[PDB]
Symmetry: T
Subunit: 64 residues, 12 copies
């Protein structure tokens, strides 16, 4: 059985790096992370100093 | 990194109040709730005494 | 077996009241209305005197 | 010919009032606003003092 | 308030059995599981010995 | 001209059998049922004794 | 309150004429037909002698 | 850089002519119109004398 | 078993004729073409002399 | 690099068996079939003797 | 009130840089640009010398 | 007439490079590749040594 968590990673560099930011976080606290699906991408301009790329991913991990 | 939880709030008053019901629950148990996105709305008629408005939200909270 | 009818309710007050308008109509002529799903919301401005909120719902009712 | 502008209204009261906020703005600067379609709804929790309901609408207006 | 978890069940028999696999897992660790919504179905052919049917479900459970 | 009715069939056995449940109902009361399109599938767990698979279908029938 | 019926019109001439075919049928049996929304278009090639254009429409009519 | 404007053209003749109506309007006031994407089609029956076909298009034009 | 190919036909006349352009091409090289589903429509304005209507279709053909 | 082909399998038994029908066909003529994604399911009632379940799948295979 | 403009940026380097191209253009002519949402990405191969990555974004800016 | 093939490219570097991987493959075996549309992006974590970015594209090529 796989379970997914819906995480939004951020990066001042790229959409790929923002995806990696989310996946890194998942791998910090979950075992057996197996894949991630991009579900949205955006750029924060107003709330930050430099543009921040955001990539939202469903991160899948195997239960048990 | 933000994480989202998918909650369905309920209210006998309104779709806005049902959204608030879900968000209140998130704020009870999570720190740093930052935003919510409505993903569905419905009305339960059969299983309840009065019509109950339901608003499903992705509630986003900042990790760490 | 459930069947759905696709109704658009209207209200000069709110999206929730427009949903109720459709559901009330369904309950007038159908037995065993069990739930409604919101599928669209809009506001008529041009064809009416006051703004009219419209909420389109699939209203589900149990057959037999 | 109709044209649409994509506006996000805000309200500390309700999703309907947030829709009205956007429509009011359109009517301030455009002639012949005819209808609005809801395309998204959300709640800002982090960037504001009280929860702020947001309703994004395509507001249609007749050209000429 | 309902919460949903996004689980992918697997079965060498059928899409229905893969849905059951996910739901069984949810019921092992959660109280008050109330419904599940199918959101995707697929078949793993390469990574497995026999074809494995996968059914991804949002499993809803009542909080409190 | 074809017309569609939106029916949700139910079965304690399978998603296919739930689709058949809806189609059987359509064929009971309609002439010239020609095809059905699956639009959603779900599982009721809370309101029933055994899990009940539900398959929502648009059932198309030829008018005249 | 508006209600919609989901009809597929057909024509050996054009997608517009197939839409008209469905709308004509609705107007034959319903009062107060007000608008139609195209939801799908297709072409039957195998089951017919000449290509037949099909346009599926939600046809809206005012109740009461 | 391309920008898009969301226009709904109308015609008493056809969906293609309604698309042309919107595109003609764009070309009246914009330079360097490059393409249009159909995003919706509908038919007004109630508010008009003859049926009026409507085709909503994103019309893209090159900036600078 | 049916297979689909995703083709974009073009016409200086109409969306229906652009669909026919794609279907004609499929019928030139494939046996047992059975149906086509419209998946997108657009208009090329910049790259061509006269406006060119484009209709993208999934064209289905029976294998064997 | 993976490539996908869009196949509709058929079965008089079940949606799972219809998916298998498509996948079997892919495996007959393609090497390195790795996974399949369900994209639609339907039931043919009019054109056949017994109901025929159809499951449309994107079947992925590794190139080279 | 926020308003969105739908811009397609281009880059011979990356999807992120194409998003930046659109956002830069928005910031040239608009005050109070606050965020951007990616809505499509593509690659032009035929009309250009080197591959050109395109990223279409809704760019949001605060009115007043 | 354009035809599309649905390819998933892979890269240990970026989503853009994974898109390029698919497009390169198309250009190896097809003439007159004209554009590509991104339809999905993901990251393989479990089946590989380093994270592998995957970008699925519809690659369009002109027939004849
Ligand atoms: C519906 C909604 C969605 C949001 N999505 C994001 C997001 O993906 N990433 C992010 O950093 N912040 C997002 N925010 C803003 C976030 O809540 C904080 O305001 C911000 O991060 C500073 O705290 C204000 N606002 C309204 N809609 C948006 C939006 N789509 N994006 C940004 N601001 C908005 C969103 C806000 C709302 C209301
Ligand atoms: C529905 C489905 C979709 C898949 N999509 C991809 C893909 O885009 N790229 C890829 O490398 N492999 C994918 N795979 C896995 C692939 O089949 C092989 O297992 C893997 O590449 C090793 O061989 C196991 N599994 C179930 N769902 C997924 C999923 N979405 N992604 C990965 N594993 C899954 C998918 C598998 C399935 C069942
Ligand atoms: C696919 C599915 C979705 C559901 N969604 C909701 C929901 O959003 N809110 C809610 O209160 N209950 C929902 N229910 C019903 C819920 O499971 C309980 O039956 C009810 O709350 C009493 O316990 C019975 N049934 C089938 N489909 C539905 C449906 N869409 N809504 C209601 N009943 C249905 C759903 C049931 C199913 C099978
Ligand atoms: C495709 C389409 C959809 C419509 N949807 C609605 C609706 O949801 N509610 C409603 O009151 N009227 C709607 N109308 C208008 C309706 O037909 C009548 O013109 C109006 O109610 C007065 O009679 C003119 N027109 C074109 N598109 C629209 C639109 N989306 N909304 C309004 N006018 C439009 C729609 C019209 C069309 C052509
Ligand atoms: C529906 C449609 C969408 C288009 N989208 C884009 C785009 O996103 N970016 C871009 O540079 N040009 C696009 N074009 C092409 C553009 O109009 C010019 O032909 C090109 O940029 C040279 O001038 C020819 N054609 C048909 N469909 C497409 C397509 N999806 N992409 C490219 N060519 C197509 C599109 C054309 C059409 C008809
Ligand atoms: C899911 C599904 C959808 C269909 N949609 C249509 C339609 O829109 N118009 C129509 O004339 N007939 C359609 N048919 C076929 C119809 O049922 C009859 O076979 C035909 O009209 C002759 O009787 C066989 N088959 C499987 N999928 C399709 C499909 N999408 N279109 C055609 N044949 C298919 C559909 C069949 C199925 C199974
Ligand atoms: Cl989710
Ligand atoms: Cl419907
Ligand atoms: Cl838009
Ligand atoms: Cl495809
Ligand atoms: Mg930096
Ligand atoms: Mg988002
Ligand atoms: Mg009360
Ligand atoms: Mg729901
Ligand atoms: Mg009042
Ligand atoms: Mg609507
Ligand atoms: Mg207040
Ligand atoms: Mg939004
Ligand atoms: Mg077995
Ligand atoms: Mg999936
Ligand atoms: Mg049993
Ligand atoms: Mg449902
Ligand atoms: Mg003729
Ligand atoms: Mg169809
Ligand atoms: Mg005329
Ligand atoms: Mg519309
Ligand atoms: Mg001509
Ligand atoms: Mg297209
Ligand atoms: Mg049998
Ligand atoms: Mg289909
Ligand atoms: Mg360079
Ligand atoms: Mg695009
Ligand atoms: Mg490397
Ligand atoms: Mg994918
Ligand atoms: Na989730
Ligand atoms: Na319906
Ligand atoms: Na717009
Ligand atoms: Na394809």
């Amino acid at each position: 059985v796989f379970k997914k968590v819906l995480l939004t990673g951020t990066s001042e560099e790229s959409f790929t790096a923002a995806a990696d930011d989310a996946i890194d976080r998942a791998e910090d606290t979950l075992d057996n992370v197996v894949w991630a699906e991009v579900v949205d991408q955006g750029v924060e301009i107003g709330a930050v100093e430099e543009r921040t790329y955001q990539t939202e991913v469903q991160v899948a991990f195997e239960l048990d």
